[PDB]
């Protein structure tokens, strides 16, 4: 493992220092359907004309990125995404830009969002939730070893592949940082107290977020919720967590250690690092190497009724992709 990560870091650093750029163009893709939207863009299912492969194409409007002050985050996203490689990270296949937009063309994950499956089914069983959580634990072990903080874990950003394994997407808040950082970003339900309190923070925020995710998966609702974000923040800072009566004692113990306001005590962040999590009793039945190797039988296999099928995704209003005849924000996105 120490050996594996060392080699992983070597690979990452070469790509980090010499990013891939301009590796395709828009007309090589046929636009099929909108798979999702966000504040400054959308993700579309596309077909690559020369191979017939399907991809998910994230299209970000440069002007909207600038208005929302997300230029540096967007540059982070692409630079980091093109440099990483892990079984549970969605792969970036191509990227390019035109007068209007930035494009990131990623592997297509046909099983849909965990969010969709979780809301419909209500909640996952503990073994089911454990299976997904293990994969997140390994992914965060990988990312953090590269000095990356992920900062946007939630079921909306986790996709389920044809084999029932998870694929993490959305590196919009990912950041390579050795010290501590201060940006107030993420999703309200998932924010660690130190982010809310403007303390400056580190990778431990990802481990808190993992606690929120596990809780949400197993309960069917997050540990801290309300109608308005301000009310959510108040609950988080109080930190009083209540668990459903059906949560096992082991699960509760793990969650009390992840949803731990005290940074000297939060799991993931101590002397033993990720091992405090990997060796916790709730994970006793988990074969970490088999998980990594994808040799474990998934608890749930998405229904796939053909290639390019999209029945696992919600329908979104389809809008025209317009490319201005003038270059927008060229200087801001020069490195993209």
């Amino acid at each position: 493992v120490k050996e594996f990560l060392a080699k992983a870091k070597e690979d990452f650093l070469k790509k980090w220092e010499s990013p891939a750029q301009n590796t395709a163009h828009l007309d090589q893709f046929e636009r099929i359907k909108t798979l999702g939207t966000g504040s400054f863009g959308r993700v579309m299912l596309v077909k690559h004309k020369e191979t017939g492969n399907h991809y998910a194409m994230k299209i970000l409007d440069k002007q909207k990125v600038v208005k929302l002050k997300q230029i540096e985050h967007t540059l982070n996203e692409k630079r980091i995404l093109q440099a990483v490689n892990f079984p549970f990270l969605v792969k970036l296949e191509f990227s390019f830009k035109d007068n209007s937009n930035l494009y990131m063309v990623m592997e297509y994950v046909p099983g849909g969002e965990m969010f969709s499956h979780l809301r419909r089914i209500g909640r996952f069983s503990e073994p089911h939730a454990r299976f997904y959580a293990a994969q997140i634990v390994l992914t965060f072990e990988y990312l953090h070893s590269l000095d990356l903080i992920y900062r946007d874990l939630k079921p909306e950003n986790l996709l389920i592949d044809q084999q029932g394994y998870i694929q993490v997407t959305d590196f919009g808040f990912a950041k390579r940082v050795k010290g501590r950082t201060w940006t107030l970003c993420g999703t309200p339900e998932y924010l660690a107290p130190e982010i809310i309190l403007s303390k400056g923070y580190n990778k431990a925020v990802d481990w808190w977020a993992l606690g929120v995710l596990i809780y949400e998966m197993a309960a069917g609702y997050p540990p801290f919720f309300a109608d308005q974000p301000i009310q959510i923040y108040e609950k988080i800072v109080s930190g009083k967590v209540r668990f459903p009566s059906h949560f096992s004692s082991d699960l509760k113990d793990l969650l009390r250690n992840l949803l731990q306001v005290d940074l000297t005590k939060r799991f993931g962040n101590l002397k033993n690092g990720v091992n405090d999590i990997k060796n916790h009793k709730w994970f006793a039945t988990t074969d970490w190497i088999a998980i990594y190797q994808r040799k474990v039988e998934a608890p749930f296999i998405p229904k796939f009724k053909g290639p390019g099928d999209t029945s696992n995704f919600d329908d979104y209003e389809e809008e025209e992709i317009r490319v201005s005849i003038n270059e927008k924000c060229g200087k801001e996105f020069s490195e993209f």
Partner: peptide
Amino acid sequence: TTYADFIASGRTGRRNAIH
């Protein structure tokens, strides 16, 4: 129940990031 409270809340749909 907490579940009923969640389901009746305004945050059971996809949640936006704060920027």
